[PDB]
Amino acid sequence: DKASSIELKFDRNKGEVGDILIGTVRINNIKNFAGFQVNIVYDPKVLMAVDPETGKEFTSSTFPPGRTVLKNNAYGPIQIADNDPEKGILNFALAYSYIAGYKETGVTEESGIIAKIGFKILQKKSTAVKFQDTLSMPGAILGTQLFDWDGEVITGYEVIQPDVLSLGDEPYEV
Amino acid sequence: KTTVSGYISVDFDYPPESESKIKSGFNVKVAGTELSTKTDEKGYFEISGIPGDMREFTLEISKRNYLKRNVTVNGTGKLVVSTEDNPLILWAGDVERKGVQDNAINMVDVMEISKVFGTRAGDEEYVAELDLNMDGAINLFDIAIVIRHFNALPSRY
Ligand SMILES: [Ca+2]
Ligand SMILES: [Ca+2]
């Protein structure tokens, strides 16, 4: 596109009980991107959030693995996790703390993966995983807040959601 | 009339030398009135002249870059809302941007501090009010204070 977005996409939208579907959170063409906070909701009776790297079930302090950006320790990346898996809420954030250094070097990290989250299927009921607004993030864009290397809030980007995990609609092929 | 008094403080570590500035400057206002004061260097506040018939009232507690807090008080006379050994706590990290706070502690606040990360008192770009623990440097200790109450709203007090 060249168009700016944050996107959550699954490797598959169908599965059997006990399969782990991988949700990958990406950013695309976010100018001078330096950090984010996101709020992602799911139905915890249908899916269980699991760490695809460690194999552990998500807890409140689990930061999702898998990023390909915001990895340069020269700029002091800081992870924050504040999930509530029992209520089907993932809420986490990461940024370079030393944004002035990042800006000075001038090598932008505008596209890549920021999180991978496993979702273990508990039952075959059609369900959605999505970015959603939260009272703890006033003025966010569907529960997403992206930051540039000036430390300012970025606006104007699309929020791409994954297709419905239509697990309750799995008929035999005709 | 009614007088209300108490102590306000913070829940983070700071250098003993900075106590005076840490504990002072918390604004306390009686909602619906012009009665207000600011805390002194021990975190003490006192507001006199509250109407005696005003048997229920709200104290609005605030400070630049702190998450505001409302405390409801029931009674008349000489009322004590907290003590020096168990003060009312206000959480640092609802940071002003262009003179405006949004009444939430979250990543927007972390990133405001990050604008002046690694600065020290004396530097052109050091901002005293963003040095949350008032130790003369803006760094990961200040960011960690914000993160301690990440996603907090005034209802979580
Ligand atoms: Ca705030
Ligand atoms: Ca400091």
Numbering used by the authors:
A (entry chain A): 16 to 189
B (entry chain B): 8 to 164
Question: What do the study authors state?
Answer:
In addition, cellulosomes are central elements for the production of readily available sugars in the gastrointestinal tract of a variety of mammals. It is now well established that a wide array of highly ordered protein-protein interactions involving dockerin and cohesin modules (defined herein as Doc and Coh, respectively) mediate both cellulosome assembly and cellulosome cell-surface attachment. Primary scaffoldins, in addition to containing multiple type-I Cohs, have a divergent type-II Doc that binds to type-II Cohs located in cell-surface anchoring scaffoldins, providing a mechanism to tether the cellulosome to the bacterial cell envelope. In addition to ScaA, inspection of C. thermocellum genome revealed the presence of an ORF (Cthe_1806) encoding a protein comprising 2177 amino acids and containing a putative type-II Doc, which was termed CipB. Type-II Docs of primary scaffoldins ScaA and CipB in C. thermocellum possess two distinct Coh-binding surfaces that recognize different Coh partners.
